[PDB]
């Protein structure tokens, strides 16, 4: 399921990401654009048994359990496949777990390098909100 920016903004705001730990809603929408291009089914295997999953690309060695990654920590205590749904709830709940503080969006490399310092607000301007 590929999302629209506004549809995704709306849904993320519905789940408490607006100003979560100080981060404005646009950060989240920007992170998703660069991580999975708004695709819930997105997946990405890395040069280590790990695979990033879903709209926010959650790692299988640390946060979810894909069953095929050596040293899975499963911190969100979730199977990586639940993160692959069209309803973002589980992906959101794990991400809120990952961002334990005001500098935690750094957990996403695309955000830190492609979003931080830019007008992320631009992604939600004109959206019903």
């Amino acid at each position, epitope marked *: 399921k590929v999302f629209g920016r506004c549809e995704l903004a709306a849904a993320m705001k519905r789940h408490g990401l607006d100003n979560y730990r*100080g981060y404005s809603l646009g950060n989240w929408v920007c992170a998703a654009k660069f991580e999975s291009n708004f695709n819930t089914q997105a997946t990405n295997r890395n040069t280590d048994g790990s695979t990033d999953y879903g709209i926010l690309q959650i790692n299988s060695r640390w946060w979810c359990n894909d069953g095929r990654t050596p040293g899975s920590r499963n911190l969100c205590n979730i199977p990586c496949s639940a993160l692959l749904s069209s309803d973002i709830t589980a992906s959101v709940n794990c991400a809120k777990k990952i961002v334990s503080d005001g500098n935690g969006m750094n957990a996403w490399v695309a955000w830190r390098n492609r979003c931080k*310092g830019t007008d992320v607000q631009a992604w939600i301007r004109g959206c019903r*909100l």
Partner: antibody
Amino acid sequence: QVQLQESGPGLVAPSQSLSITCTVSGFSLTGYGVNWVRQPPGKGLEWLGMIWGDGNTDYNSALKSRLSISKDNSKSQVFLKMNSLHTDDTARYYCARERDYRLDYWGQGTTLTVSS
Amino acid sequence: DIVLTQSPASLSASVGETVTITCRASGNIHNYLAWYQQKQGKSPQLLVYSTTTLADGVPSRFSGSGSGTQYSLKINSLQPEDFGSYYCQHFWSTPRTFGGGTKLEIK
């Protein structure tokens, strides 16, 4: 330790083009924006414009045509250039870091007076 | 531009009083509003951002509220160090603007 410090000429005549510097430390210029704000003697704060982390700039609509903001990421400096100085430009000039839609750190400010 | 109308201009109050400063936006700024305090000859200091979030180190006696186009800063039991000037600023698109300010002086 995030700090922004301004440095300007102090007294200029309308016969000049103003250049103010803002040297920052404790953070990268590509990761944050820098706003420029002034405060005329005994008046309120006026927003002049900004430069985003990515180099893009935005300006106060009235002052747009006589302002120019640039930066040198490597020297950790942001510059405010202003032309056609009016005596109304006399003010204290500030540079402040923008971090996710709030100016969280401000330099001390530098006082500028426009003469004849 | 979205202009901000801040009121009142001055406020005389005593230590222990609770006061309210308001900023009305000429258009919806969607909660992208911050408040600053500026003391005698000092640079502005952020207090609240995103309408209701306190900056670090900022005491709980300060609280912000508002939505759409009416915004407020409430100070509960003013302390001697709260006297100074206060300003609101919007962060909805560009250009950004400030409110005219409020001088909070001792009664």
